[PDB]
Amino acid sequence: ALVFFAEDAAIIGLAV
Amino acid sequence: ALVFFAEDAAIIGLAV
Amino acid sequence: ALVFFAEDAAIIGLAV
Amino acid sequence: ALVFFAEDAAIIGLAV
Amino acid sequence: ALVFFAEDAAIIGLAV
Amino acid sequence: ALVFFAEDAAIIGLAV
Amino acid sequence: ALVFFAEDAAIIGLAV
Amino acid sequence: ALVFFAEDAAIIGLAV
Amino acid sequence: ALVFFAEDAAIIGLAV
Amino acid sequence: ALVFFAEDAAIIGLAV
Amino acid sequence: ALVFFAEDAAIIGLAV
Amino acid sequence: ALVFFAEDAAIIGLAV
Amino acid sequence: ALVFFAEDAAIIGLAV
Amino acid sequence: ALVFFAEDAAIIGLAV
Amino acid sequence: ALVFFAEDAAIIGLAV
Amino acid sequence: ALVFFAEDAAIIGLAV
Ligand SMILES: [Cl-]
Ligand SMILES: [Cl-]
Ligand SMILES: [Cl-]
Ligand SMILES: [Cl-]
Ligand SMILES: [Cl-]
Ligand SMILES: [Cl-]
Ligand SMILES: [Cl-]
Ligand SMILES: [Cl-]
Ligand code: NA
Ligand code: NA
Ligand code: NA
C-alpha cells in the first residue's frame, strides 16, 4: 500500500 | 526556528 | 551547556 | 532562515 | 579558520 | 490587494 | 510628506 | 522588528 | 527572471 | 559594499 | 534619467 | 545607523 | 543592567 | 585596546 | 576568475 | 603625503 502524509499536532500516515 | 523532520515508528519534528 | 547565537527578527540562544 | 556568525579578518553571517 | 562564539558565564571561541 | 514590503534578514511582503 | 511603496501589477506611491 | 521604507528625496527606514 | 527597480516620476521594473 | 535589490517570488539582495 | 537604489549605511540613488 | 548589541538574558540591538 | 561585549585575546563583558 | 562590534550590511569593529 | 579592485575606506576585491 | 599600495591578504596603504 501507498502511505500519504498529513499534519493532523503531528505528522501522520494515511494508508492506501 | 527551523523544524526538521525524521522518522523515529512516527514522524517527529526537531527544532532548531 | 553551551549557548550559540543566531538571528531568527531577534537574536536567540541555542542551547547545547 | 537562521543567521549564525563567525570571525573569518571580519565577522560574517552564515545563513541557514 | 572560522571562529564561532558560544556562552560557556564567559564567551568562548570555537575554531574550525 | 496591495503588497507592502519590509525588512525582517529577508525582505517580506505584507498583503492588504 | 512620506511616500510609501506598494505593488498594486505596478509599483505605486502612497502619500502620507 | 520590521523595517518599512519611505521617500522623505532620500529613502529612509521606519522601524516597527 | 530578475526584476530590478528604478525611478523613471514612477517606479518601473527592469527585467533580466 | 553596495547592496542592490531584485525580485527573484521574493525580493533578494545582491552584493557588490 | 533612471535612478537605481542601493544600500551604501543609507539607501542611496544612483543616477543614470 | 550603527547597531550595537547587548545582553538585557536576551541579546538586543541598540541603534545609533 | 546591560552587558556589552568587546574583544580584549578574549571576549569580555562590560556591565552597564 | 578594546574592539566593539556593530552592524553597519557588514559587522564592523570599533577600536578603542 | 577575474578580480577587480575598488576603494570601498579600504581597497577590496571583487570577484568575477 | 603620498600613499603607496601593497598586497599584505588585503591591499593596504602606506603613507609617506
Ligand atoms: Cl487581506
Ligand atoms: Cl534617516
Ligand atoms: Cl506611479
Ligand atoms: Cl525594459
Ligand atoms: Cl549577494
Ligand atoms: Cl534603544
Ligand atoms: Cl559580511
Ligand atoms: Cl584608539
Ligand atoms: Na514586486
Ligand atoms: Na551596504
Ligand atoms: Na585610493
Secondary structure (DSSP) of H1-16: --EEEEE---EEEEE-
Min Cα distance D2 → chain N (Å) is 16
- What per-residue string of b and e applies to J1-16 under the rule 16 or more CB within 10 Å gives b? ebbbbbbeeebebeee
What DSSP element (H or E) covers P9? none
Residue M13 burial (CB < 10 Å; 0-12/13-18/19+)? middle
CA-nearest of D5, C6, G5 to F11 is: G5
CA distance J4 to N6: 21
CA distance O3 to J15: 15
Nominal resolution in Å?
1.7
SS (H, E, C) N1-16: CCEEEEECCCEEEEEC
Query: Residues of N numbered 1-16 whose beta carbons fall under 8 angstroms of chain K's beta carbons: which are they?
Result: 8-9
Contact between E2 and E11 under an 8 Å Cβ cutoff? The reply is no
B2 φ, ψ to 5°? -90, 140
Q: Establish whether chain L is in contact with chain N, requiring a minimum of 3 CB pairs below 8 angstroms.
A: yes
Experimental method: X-ray
CA-nearest of F9, J7, C7 to H3 is: F9
Which residues of chain C lie closer than 8 angstroms to E4, CB-CB? 4
P6 φ, ψ to 5°? -145, 145
